[PDB]
Amino acid sequence: GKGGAKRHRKVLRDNIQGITKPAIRRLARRGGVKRISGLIYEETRGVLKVFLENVIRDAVTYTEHAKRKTVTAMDVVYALKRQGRTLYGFG
Amino acid sequence: KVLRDNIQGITKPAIRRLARRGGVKRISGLIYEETRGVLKVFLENVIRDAVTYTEHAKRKTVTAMDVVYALKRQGRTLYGFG
Amino acid sequence: PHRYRPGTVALREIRRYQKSTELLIRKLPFQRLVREIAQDFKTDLRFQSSAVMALQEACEAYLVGLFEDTNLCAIHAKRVTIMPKDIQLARRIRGER
Amino acid sequence: KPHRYRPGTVALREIRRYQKSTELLIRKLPFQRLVREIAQDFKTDLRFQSSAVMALQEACEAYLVGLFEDTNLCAIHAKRVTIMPKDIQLARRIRGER
Amino acid sequence: AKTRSSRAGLQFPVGRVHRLLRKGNYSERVGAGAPVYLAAVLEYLTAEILELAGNAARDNKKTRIIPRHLQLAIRNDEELNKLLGRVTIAQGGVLPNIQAVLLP
Amino acid sequence: AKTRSSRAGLQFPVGRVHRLLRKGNYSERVGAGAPVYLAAVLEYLTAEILELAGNAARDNKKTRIIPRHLQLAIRNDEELNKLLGRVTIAQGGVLPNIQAVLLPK
Amino acid sequence: RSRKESYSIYVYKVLKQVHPDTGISSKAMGIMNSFVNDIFERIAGEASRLAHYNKRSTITSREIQTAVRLLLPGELAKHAVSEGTKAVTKYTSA
Amino acid sequence: KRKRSRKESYSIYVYKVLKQVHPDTGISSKAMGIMNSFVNDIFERIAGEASRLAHYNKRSTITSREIQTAVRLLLPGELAKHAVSEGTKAVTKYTSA
Amino acid sequence: PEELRQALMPTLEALYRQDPESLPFRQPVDPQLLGIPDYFDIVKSPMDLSTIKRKLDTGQYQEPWQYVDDIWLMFNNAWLYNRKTSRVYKYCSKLSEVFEQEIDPVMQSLGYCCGRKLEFSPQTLCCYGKQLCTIPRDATYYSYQNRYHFCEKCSKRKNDTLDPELFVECTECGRKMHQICVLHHEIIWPAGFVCDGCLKKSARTRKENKFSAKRLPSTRLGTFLENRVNDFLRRQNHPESGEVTVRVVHASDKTVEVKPGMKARFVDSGEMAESFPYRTKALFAFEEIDGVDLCFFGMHVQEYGSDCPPPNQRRVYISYLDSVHFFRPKCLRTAVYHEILIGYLEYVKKLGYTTGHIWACPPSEGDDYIFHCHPPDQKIPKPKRLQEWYKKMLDKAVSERIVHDYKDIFKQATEDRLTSAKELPYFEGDFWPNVLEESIKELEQENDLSQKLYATMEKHKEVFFVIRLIAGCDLMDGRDAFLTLARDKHLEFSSLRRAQWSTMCMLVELHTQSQD
DNA sequence: CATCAATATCCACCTGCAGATTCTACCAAAAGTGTATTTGGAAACTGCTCCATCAAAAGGCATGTTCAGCTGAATTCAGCTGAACATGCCTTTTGATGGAGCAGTTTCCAAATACACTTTTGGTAGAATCTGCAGGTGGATATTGAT
DNA sequence: ATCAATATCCACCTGCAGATTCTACCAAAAGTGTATTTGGAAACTGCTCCATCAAAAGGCATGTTCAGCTGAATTCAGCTGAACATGCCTTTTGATGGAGCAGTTTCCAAATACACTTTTGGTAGAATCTGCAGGTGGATATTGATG
C-alpha cells in the first residue's frame, strides 16, 4: 500500500458537530441576524438534524419502493413537495 | 336589503371570552379591532372560495359542503359536516 | 364592598371557557357579516344554516389558534398584556401575510 | 492603535454580502457525511446521487434562513437584537412543527 | 356464499372501499389486496380513536361519547395530534392548558 | 394541416397537455378546449415570470437570466410571492433587507 | 332521493367490539365519518401519486403501505403495516 | 442497441416564449431547470385542483370551465383574471379556427 | 571505470534533485517498517538507488546499459507493485520522465544512439486447431511447448507481455547497439556492423544499400506514379519535401467464384458466369527521409479486363488502402495522396478501364489494413470525414478533366436502369456480395430480392462511390500475409524509426523472394 | 461635528473560459384528421325540502359608567458574553479510478378487467320503548382578600 | 393566624330531544364463474455512476480585549380589570309564500377508439460564439479614531 500519509479524522460519529462555526454564522447572517447567542449553534444543529429526520426518512421510504437502494434527487423533490417545501431546479 | 356596518356586532366581551379560551388574561384596547380585522381577512379568504364553488355548481345557495371543502383546501380542515 | 383581585376573574373565565366547548361568538352578527361579505362579492346569494355553523366554528378555531400564538408571544416578551404587535408578529411568522 | 471596526458596521456589511450572493455556505463533505449517517440510521448500505445532496443542501439552507429570519423578527419584537433559544423555541412552536 | 367482508373478518367493507377507489380514478387498475389494506388501516385508526374517546369519557364520568371527548382523545395523543395538526374538530374546544407564569 | 397550438395561437403544445391529462388519471374524460385553456394560462404565467426576470436582469446589468434574477422577479411581486409562498428557489438567495433596529444610529 | 353513504354501522360495530357499554352522539359519528373519508382520500391520493412517479398504473399493497408509512408516524404506522400484512397474507392464503 | 435515454422538458417552448418576450436575453441551465420545475409544479397543482372539482361535482369530463374555476380559486387575483381573459380569448378563437 | 562514472553522476543527480518525488527511493524498501510484508512476494529484486550509487562507486557496471536496465527495472517494479492512482506510481512516472529527458544527450555523448528502454507492443498469437481463428489479447489463453496456442472455445495464463527490442554488437568497438535506431540488417551487410563513430573516425562510409525500393523492378504504372509525384513536388517546391519512389511489387491473375446462393439463384439458370477473372496489383510509395527509404502509402486493387464476362467489363475496384502520417512535409502528404490516386485513375483510364469503385470503410479501432501497429497519435478518420475526403479527391480529379463525373452507387444504379442484382459488379471480398447473400437467406426464412437490394443501397448510398472513367509474390497475395509477417517479426509502424525498420525488412524480404 | 486614513466594495474595463447558442442530419415519438361508436349533461318538466321573512314574549349578556392596582414603559446602572482581530493550522475539492447498481432486452405465468348472472344487505319509511345528560335544587367544600 | 363572602364540585330528581331497538324493501351494491388483456414476476446484460484515494488552499479552530448588548432594580400614568345600573339586541317558539334544490326523459354535440399519414422534438457530434468570474490599477464613501 505504502503512501506514507494518513489521518484519523475521528469526526465520522459526531458529524453533527461537523457543521462548522463559520457555516452556521453565515446561515444566521443570511437570515438577517445581527448578534448570535452562544447556545444558538447546537440548537440549530439539532433543528437541522430534525429536518433531516423529516425529509430523508420520506426519501428513503420512496427509494425502497422502486426496488432501489440509491436515493434519487427526484425522490427528495417529492419528499420536500409533500411537506409544503417544494424545491425547484431538480426536476 | 343591503345592510351595512355590522362589524360592531363582533362584541367586545365576546372577543374577551374568545381570548379567555385562548388563555389570555389581559387585553388591550386595540386587540378587539385587530381581531375584527383579522377575522374579516379570514372571511374574505374563505367566502371567496365558497362563492366560487357555488358558482361552478350552477347553484344560487351556499352549502356547508362547499364551505368545508374550501376550508380544507385552505389548510383549515373542519369536521362534523362530512 | 367585596372585590376580587384583578386577575382572579380572568383565571376563572379562562378555566370556564377551556372546560366548555359551546360557541362563544353571537350567531346573528356573524351571520349578518357573512351576508354582507357575500353581497360585496356577488349579489343574490343564500346560505344554509349548516354552512353558517361550519363558518362560525372554523372562525372560532382559527381565532383561538391566533390567540394561543399571541399569548405565547406576549409571555415571550415578559408581558401579560396582549398588543397588536404580537398579532402581526404571529401572522407574519405563520406566513399568512 | 490598530484599526478595528465596531461590531455593527462590518456585521451589516457581511449580512449584505451574503444576502446579495447565492453560493452555498455549508461545506459539501461534512453535510454529506451527516446525511449519509442519518440515511444508514434507517437502512444500511445506501447510495447517494450528487444532485440529491445538492437538493438536500438547498432545502436545509432555505429552511434555516427562514427560521433565522423568524428568530430575528422575534428578537426585534422583544426589544432585542440577539437571537436566543427562547426566540427559536417560540418560532418553532408557533410555526406548527412542534 | 361467503362475502369477502366476512372472509377478511374486518368490520369495514372491503367491496365498498374498493368501489370508492374505483370511482376516484386514482389509477386505471386497482389491486385485489388494496381495498383489504385500506379497510384494515381505516379500521385500526377508528378503533384507536374510539377507544381513546371512550377512555376520555370514562375520566369524565360520561357513558356517551361526545365531540369534546374526541378533542380530548386526539389532542392528548402526540402522534395523533401530529396527524390531525391542520384539522379542526367540530364542537371540540381546546384542552385545558395554561402557562405557569400566568398562574399567581 | 395545422397543430392545435398554432390553431389556438399558443406556443405550448396542446396535444401534449391533453396526453398528460389523459395519463395522469385526473378524470375518465377530458375535453378538447381544456388543454387549450390550460396552455394559455401556462403561457401567460411563463411570459410574466420571464419578463419580470428580464427586468431584474437588466436592473442587475446582466443580459442572461440566472436563478438570482428569478428570485428577484418572483419575490419582488407580492402577488407571485403569495402564489409561491411555500416554494424555495434553488440558488436564489434572499432579498437585501436590514431591520430598522439593527441599523446604526 | 340520492343515496348518501356513511360509515355509521361499521363505527358502531367497532365500538361494540371495543366499548360495548358506551354511547355515541350524532355529532361524534359525523366527525368519525369525516375522519375516515379524508384519511382514505389522503392515502389513496398519495398512493396514486407514488404510482405515477414510478410509472405504475396499478394500485397494489406496496404503494398504500408506503402511503401509510409516510402519513401515519411511528407506532400507528408499524401497527397498521403489520395488520395489513397479516390481512393480505390471509387473503392470499384463502 | 436503442439505448438512447429520453426525457420530457419544455425547454424549446420556454425558449421561444422568451424570444417572443425578450429576444436578447438568455437562460442558464440552472434557470432552465428551475423554470421547468415551476411549470411542472403549477401544471400539477392546477390539474389536480380541476380533477378535484370535477370529482366533487360528479363530473367525469374535464372542460375549460372547471379549469377557469380552479384558476380563480388558486391563482392570485390579477394574475387569475388576466389568465382567465387570455384563455377565454384563445379558446374562443380556436373554436372559430 | 572513471569515465562511465563521470558520465553517470549528472543524470542521477538530476534525478535526485527532484524532491519530494525522489524521497521514497532514497532508502531501501523495508517491509516491516512500511507495513508491506508482501513486497518480497511480488518483487524478486529488492534493491534501490543507494545500491546503484554503491555499484557505480565500486565500478560494478562494465558499461552503462547495465545501469539503464537496472533503473528501468526499478521503474517497472514501482509501476507493478503500486496502482497508478497511488502517489508512488506518479512519482516513479515523474522520475522516469526526468531520466528519459536527461539520459539521451549523456548517452549519446559516449557514441550510443540513445538510452531509452524500448519494448514492442504485445504480440497477438494465432490459433492452430481451427486454423482460422486467432488468440485474443488481454485474455486467458492456452499454450503448449511455446509453439501451440489455443483459445477459450477451441498452462493457463493471461496474454499481457511486452517484447524488448533486440541489440546488435559492434564488430570494432564491441558496443551493444540497437538494430532499429541505425537500421542495420545482416543480409544487407554480411561483413558485419560498424557504428557511425567508428566510420567517421577512419573517414569511412557505410556500404551502399542495394536492398532499396529504387532498385526494385520497374513498372509502367509505378514509374508514372513516381514521376507525377516528383513533378508535383517540384511544382510545390517545398524545402522539407523529398524524393518519392513508387513501385508495383505484386501482380498476379486471380479468379473470384460466385457464392453458392447467387450460383443457385442465377448461375444455374445460365444467366451469369461461374467466375470472373481479374488481375490484382499491389503498389507502395516510398520516400527518402534522412537518406532512408520509408514506406508511407500502399494500395490493393482488382482490375477486370475486357475478357472478363459482364457486368464486370472495364471495371477497377479498390479492395484496401492504408497510409502512415510520416510523409514530409505533413501539409503536402494529403496532396501527394491526391496525386497518387489521380495518377492511378489516369493510368487505368489510359489502359481502357471505364468504371472505378471505391469502398469508404474506415478501419475499426485496433484493426490495421496493411501497415500493422498504427501510431497512437494517428487519428482514425470517421466515415463522414472520409467521405468528405473522397469527395475532395473526386473534385480534384474532375478538375483535371481526367474523370468525367462521379455519382453514388444508388444514383449510378438509378441511372443504369437497374432491375436485378445481376447488373451489379461482382468483386472479391466486397460487402455487396455478402449483403446480397444475407438478403437471399432472409428471403429463404421468409422482385423481393430487388426490393431488398434497393433498400440496402439507399441505406448505404454514401459509403460506396462509383467513378465513370470513360463516358459516351505469395508474400503479398492479400493483406493477411503481410500483416501476419509484420506481427511475427514485430514490424511495427508506431514510430518513425520502427516504420523505417519495417520498410527495410519488407524490402529485404521482397528482394530475397525475387531471387529463387 | 469636520476631516488624516485603511479598507470592503462598484464600476470603467478586459481578457480568458465553460456554457449557451447555431447549424445539419437521423429517427423514434407525438399528433391532426378521418371514420364509427358511445355518452352525459343541457333543455324541459316537475315534486318538494329547507332558505328567507315575519311576529312576539323574554332574558343575559351588551352598553355604559365608576374605582383603582398592577404593569409596560421609561430610566439608570452593572455584570458580561459575544464581536472583531491576529495566529496557527487543517479539511476540502477536484481529478482520477475500480466495480456496484439502473434500465434495456426477452419469456411468459400469475393477476386484474368486462360483463353476464345470482345473491347479501344499508338507508330508510314507519312507530314504540329504553336510554343519559340538559336543567333545576340544595348544601358540602376549596378560594381568597383583608379583616 | 383566623374569618366572612363566592365560586366550585357534587348528590339527586325530572321532562324530553335524541340514541337505541323492532319490520319490511330493494336497488345499489356485493358476490361468483369464463374470456381477455396486460403490468408485472424473472434472468442475462451494456451502460451509468457511486465509493475511494492524493494534493492545494480556501478557508476553520483558538486566545485577547472591550464598549455595547443584555440584564437587574425603581417608579409612574394610566387603563384595563372588577363591580354594578340599565336595557336592548339576540333566542326560541310558531307559521308561511315561494325562490330555489333536486328527481326523471330525450337526445345531439362532444369525447372515445383506433389507422394512418404528417410533423415534430430530444439527442449525438461540429464548431463558432458569448456572458461572466477574477484581478490588477484606480477610487469612493465610511467609519473608527484624532483632534
Numbering used by the authors:
A (entry chain B): 11 to 101
B (entry chain F): 20 to 101
C (entry chain E): 38 to 134
D (entry chain A): 37 to 134
E (entry chain C): 14 to 117
F (entry chain G): 14 to 118
G (entry chain D): 31 to 124
H (entry chain H): 28 to 124
Give passages from the manuscript.
Here, we report cryogenic electron microscopy structures in which a p300/CREB-binding protein (CBP) multidomain monomer recognizes histone H4 N-terminal tail (NT) acetylation (ac) in a nucleosome and acetylates non-H4 histone NTs within the same nucleosome. p300/CBP not only recognized H4NTac via the bromodomain pocket responsible for reading, but also interacted with the DNA minor grooves via the outside of that pocket. This directed the catalytic center of p300/CBP to one of the non-H4 histone NTs. That is, p300/CBP reads H4NTac at the bromodomain pocket, rotates in multiple directions, and rapidly writes NTac to non-H4 histones within the nucleosome independently of the DNA sequence.
When the 180-bp nucleosome containing H4K12ac/K16ac (i.e., H4acNuc) was used, we obtained a group of structures in which p300BRPHZT binds to H4acNuc in several different modes by three-dimensional (3D) classification. Of these complexes, the p300BRPHZT·H4acNuc complex, in which HAT is in close proximity to H2BNT, had the largest number of single particles and its structure could be determined at the highest resolution (p300H2B·H4acNuc). In p300BRPHZT, cryo-EM maps of BRPH were detected, but not of AIL, ZZ, or TAZ2. The structure-determined p300 multidomain (p300BRPH) bound to H4acNuc in a Slinky-like bent conformation via bromodomain and HAT. The bromodomain pocket of p300BRPH recognized the K12ac side chain of H4NT. Around HAT of p300BRPH, the density of H2BNT toward HAT could be modeled for the C-terminal residues after D22. Density maps were also detected near the substrate-binding pocket of HAT, but the residues of H2BNT bound to HAT could not be determined. The distance between the substrate-binding pocket and D22 (~10 Å) suggests that p300BRPH of this complex acetylates lysine residues from the N-terminal side of H2BNT up to K16. In p300H2B·H4acNuc and p300H2A·H4acNuc, bromodomain binding to H4NTac interacted with the minor groove at the superhelical location (SHL) + 2.
